[PDB]
Amino acid sequence: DPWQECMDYAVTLARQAGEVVCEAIKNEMNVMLKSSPVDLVTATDQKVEKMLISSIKEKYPSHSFIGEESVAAGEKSILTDNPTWIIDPIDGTTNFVHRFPFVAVSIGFAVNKKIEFGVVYSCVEGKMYTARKGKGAFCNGQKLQVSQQEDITKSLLVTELGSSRTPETVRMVLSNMEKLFCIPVHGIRSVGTAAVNMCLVATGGADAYYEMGIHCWDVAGAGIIVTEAGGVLMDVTGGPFDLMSRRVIAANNRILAERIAKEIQVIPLQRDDED
Template identity: 50%
Template sequence: MADYDQIYDLVLKLVKEGGALVKETISRPKNVEVKSCDVDLVTETDKQVEKLLMDGISSKFPDHRFIGEETTASGVKVELTDSPTWIIDPVDGTMNFVHGFPHTCISIALVDKKIPQIGMVYNPVMEQLFTARKGKGAFLNGKPIHVSDVKEMKKAILMFEMGTSRDPAKMKIVMENLAILAPLIHGTRALGSAALNMCMVALGGADCNFEYGIHAWDIAAGDIIVREAGGVCIDPSGGPFDVLSRRVLCASTQELADEVTKVLVQYYPERD
């Protein structure tokens, strides 16, 4: 296994190259394709950034494996083994990207022997680069970040999304949870990007985030960034986090996470 320093430096370079492409194309007309439904979109930039990252990593580390949003959408099976595996969302917040809304990012994480080692979330439009390495802390543009110390819902800002599915059963639960949580918290926020929502918790700008129906590539980088910033990342039911479960809850403190899980109506989508 190559040194993680060498791997980190290579991927940081590639992420910045991909970010330049995102920043360059966000204000241009786009060729938009519909995937599973009218709000699940992909653009040529998604495909180009994913290829840039995969080709760049493979050229130096040919034994590394990948779980990428666009390759998975084309029929490649999701499989997480003990091999070094990169979990990639080339443009998280594609709907934002399509509309020119500036909260969009590259999300990439390295999982080795099923243990997260590196996470990067890069919003090149807003010039926000979130990074983390196992045991080394979390950073925004090179400066250390830390979660808030909020332990109670009544003092919490909660990140909360509808997501990219309009399945009636899921939407019913989404609206039920909004109705339950709204009177109990300081407020809700949504950036339209699962990765950036998680990074807001890591930054301390928000205190909790949960979502059902997202995918491994939406949350793998955010998971290690939140943990390295001192937060917790669990299943919304209160159990351990599973990157393939399509469910996530992260929070500034265990106390806050426990309080939120007690009131949530649960939804269990098909696993990745």
């Protein structure tokens, strides 16, 4: 693990950022909009992202960045082979402005376009999720393992309704949920952050997560936490996972993942690596 120093620095930065987010979640909210009345942001997201990028630049000036709010400011979401930090300063902005207690700082680190480590700090909970390729996944000193469940009819899934309110899109998201729900599955849960939903699969508390519409910074930190806990990532088609494709299944195993893929009708989405 030659990236141990980098990950340990990422953990300290995530904890620092988490403290900023915790302080801000107790204070007055000035909610701002991005593309729609349900695509939210605050000054805290922007402050935290700028702190993270400037701190990483100081120690690792040759590295590259992909950050949610930097992309909103016009930066590109193109992943080269160069070591790259893929940052979501606050995953769960809707939760944050409501003080719903699942908000995370997410950092994924890629080399040769492959994730080498991931850090997800659920900062109201004070849960530091981490994983390094080949070294396992952890939450606050506890090594993580996905569940063993291979029977979809005894599974607990996690998903979210999405940021679209387009009637045809909402109908397809609800149809997909209906089809899975009526297999049946034991249930479906929604805590409101992609990174925390995925970390819940890594812990074994849920058996699988799926969503269409995520961005690369939503899944770059948590994906490796799922796989180092023994899980799998794939596209909702069953095809290989792609960070820039807007789609993911993060599951305990390929049996549940492929069974979920068989019920998901795909919605058209703009890739993060294209204009």
